[PDB]
């Protein structure tokens, strides 16, 4: 699946005359892409039960099984069928220096390591007060708290106080 | 989810108080008023209703949290909040 597109893309954007900052931006994202992926697998699955005592866990319904499996077998091959079938209608870059051609795999594997180490650091008994970076990232990056409250108040206050009245 | 009934609540309710080591099992009664007879400190009462909160999965408001006092009354407030009548 994602290899036939993302690995080609990360190689492609690296292999072009682009903004230097923009190119570095994708690599951090790909590493961060694995980061939250581990977070889901770690907290949700790899752990001990934390749900209410009455367990009603169930997936045996054929509707769920058929639907997921139908999409699952599609994801397994996916890009192999499409890439091999569509006519070659982009210019394929060939001579990549091996250090950057591995970047599509290096960053995500790197992001796997720290995210795994950071996630099981929760297993460690130590407790830390919130870092100001966490206070920023966890609140949707500070955007909704301001930009959905400041402009909305002004335009609304303008409508009633000024304008109409 | 099968309809959870009052017999199910009390069975789950006194299960946790029996679990709570300061409430030893033998003197558990459905109407065991905590500090008058179990000697359970009121500062731990605010700790057991959140134990109930995770037990049944919902929030008990603070207005009746300190009012939620008797194990029978624990069940009594559980039933109506989830319209448990059977």
């Amino acid at each position: 699946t994602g290899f036939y597109s993302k690995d080609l893309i990360i190689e492609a954007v690296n292999m072009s005359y682009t903004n230097a900052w923009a190119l570095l931006m994708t690599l951090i994202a790909t590493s961060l892409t694995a980061a939250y992926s581990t977070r889901i697998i770690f907290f949700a699955f790899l752990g001990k039960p934390r749900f209410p005592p009455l367990v009603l866990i169930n997936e045996n319904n054929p509707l769920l099984i058929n639907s997921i499996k139908r999409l699952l077998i599609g994801s397994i091959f996916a890009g192999f069928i499409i890439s091999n079938n569509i006519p070659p209608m982009t210019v394929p870059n060939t001579t990549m220096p091996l250090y950057m051609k591995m970047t599509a795999l290096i960053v995500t594997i790197m992001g796997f390591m720290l995210a795994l180490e950071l996630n099981n650091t929760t297993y460690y008994l130590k407790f830390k007060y919130p870092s100001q970076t966490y206070k920023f990232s966890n609140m949707l990056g500070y955007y909704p708290s301001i930009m959905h409250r400041l402009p909305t108040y002004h335009n609304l206050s303008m409508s009633q106080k000024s304008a109409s009245s | 989810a099968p309809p959870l009934t009052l017999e199910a609540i009390k069975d789950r309710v006194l299960y946790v108080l029996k679990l709570y080591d300061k409430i030893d099992p033998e003197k558990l009664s459905v109407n065991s008023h905590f500090m008058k007879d179990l000697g359970l400190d009121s500062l731990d009462q605010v700790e057991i209703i959140m134990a109930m909160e995770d037990e049944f999965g919902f929030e008990i408001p603070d207005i009746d949290a300190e009012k939620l006092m008797c194990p029978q009354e624990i069940v009594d407030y559980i039933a109506d909040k989830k319209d448990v009548y059977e």
Binding site: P53, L54, V55, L56, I57, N58, N60, I65 | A1, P2, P3, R12
Partner: peptide, 20 residues
Amino acid sequence: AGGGVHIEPRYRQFPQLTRS
């Protein structure tokens, strides 16, 4: 939620599974 559910729940136990 009627009787005859093959995924009959449990309390504080590992839920039953199936070979399928």
